[PDB]
Amino acid sequence: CGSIVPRREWRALASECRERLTRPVRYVVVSHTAGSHCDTPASCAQQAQNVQSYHVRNLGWCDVGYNFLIGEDGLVYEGRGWNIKGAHAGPTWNPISIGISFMGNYMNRVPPPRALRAAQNLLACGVALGALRSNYEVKGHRDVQPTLSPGDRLYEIIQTWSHYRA
Amino acid sequence: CGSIVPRREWRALASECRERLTRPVRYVVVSHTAGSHCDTPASCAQQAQNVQSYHVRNLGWCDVGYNFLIGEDGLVYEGRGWNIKGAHAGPTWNPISIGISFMGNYMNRVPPPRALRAAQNLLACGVALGALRSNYEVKGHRDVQPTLSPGDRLYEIIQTWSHYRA
């Protein structure tokens, strides 16, 4: 499912993580990187590679902090995966939720449909694989931590989502 | 299911096709367009147009000839869709089969992983929807017509698929 871009396909550094998730998982956290945005597979690969580099080389972590990244090229970029605990929402949230992030600042712009599809397509692919539980619940980043993520424009959009719950 | 690019989004001429396919469909025929390859959501939307254009405007079909198209961008472009009859492998095979075409000439080139993932993941969405038989059979275009389609390289890769019977 999900037509996800493998970690090795974006030249991603070998994860060093261990902590697993209590799947089937209940919560989902939509963030934004707030970095540079990309719209081509070649440019979007370089960007998740770049997000990782900052989380691993500089911030110290075992792997890129999100479970999955969504590019404006329409493709879902693999981070920690369906099983390995996140690093996106704080210690209350990281072990009970798959975090996903859109590549770009979405304060004063919206993400293309092809990403928002790819986002939903993924979440379905979650249930399908069994990592998400059938009636998964979706939160914005600002719901669960003091933060301007996931961007003013993207925030409203995910509020009107089938599986959303405030 | 699926991250399929809908017709609106690639700017497609409205279909005048009404003839249907009896669900569930048994077969799937893999072709190439033997044309210019694209590899960005934008450039691949234009390629979808160019193909359909040649099909409606020159050959005089009700729509683009294929049911779906696969881009080297890693996206599925919607054509005649799941329920409508195609025009991609002559008249014995057209009424009993879904035709998918990779956008390119694959005689000396391979489609990248993401093309092949999107196609395969589509077929699974087909199965899941009940539009394909769960025991569907993938055929080469050159198996069911005397063509070079879907190109020597791509032909080899579809042969390795779970569901390939010649």
Added chain:
Amino acid sequence: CGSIVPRREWRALASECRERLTRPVRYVVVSHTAGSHCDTPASCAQQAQNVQSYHVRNLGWCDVGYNFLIGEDGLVYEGRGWNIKGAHAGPTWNPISIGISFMGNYMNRVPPPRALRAAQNLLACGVALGALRSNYEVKGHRDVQPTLSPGDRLYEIIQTWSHYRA
């Protein structure tokens, strides 16, 4: 040749099968159905209706698997016929054989002599048309797949035939 009962006469569902045998075929493979038997054309047409139904409804196949079916009514029923490959004895033998089945279970019964005649003649006819080699070889279902088919009593018998090869 042929006093074979055609498909339309026993009220067959239409074959979705399309792959073709090379003529002249070299091998014939004798199976039984291991089901109930029949001795009227009104039951032996119902029987082949039910045998096809098993294969197309439950197994989800394209058509009844056998190329023809021999009834104890004394008549041959047209399955896939001479030209379409059967799904009767696995994928080595299927494309180099005609597979005929006796509607009944011949573990604890011989097929009545009219049913034997029916089968023997079918082959005779076959050779005349060019659909079998003049020196075709007969196997039993157990000789090429692990099965009790065509039944002990019927296996005894077919071992006596001119064209048999152990």
Added chain:
Amino acid sequence: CGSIVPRREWRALASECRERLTRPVRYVVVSHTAGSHCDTPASCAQQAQNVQSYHVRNLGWCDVGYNFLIGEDGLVYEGRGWNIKGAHAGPTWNPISIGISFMGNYMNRVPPPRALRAAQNLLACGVALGALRSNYEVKGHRDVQPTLSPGDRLYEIIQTWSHYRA
């Protein structure tokens, strides 16, 4: 898990098969051998020799067809095992399944409780080994192939199971 009579111990011929399954496997096809049955370690180790002999001497195969076998003595016998592709349910299911095979004929006859535990256990093992999926599906041989296997009484039983799915 454990407690499986190895090939060496029932005195199998050297396997020549090379084609491997992909783990974890989804489907399990219960069959029967259809012949006479055993209820002692030495009678059953003989039984499996009789069987393999047939499949390797008479049918010219690389090895015994079934991935495993289940004597009424209470013990599992190694076949092709978890990692090698079977030859027990046609070119369709053989590459996506584990073929277990009760030794006997179970048309009017149940296997004894200890043969049913031997099998139920072998599967949990396979799950715990990551050889099978945790949501594996248990098909009858008759559910996927034209046959009476695994016998009208054993089939009745397998239908009751947690992981049965026609």
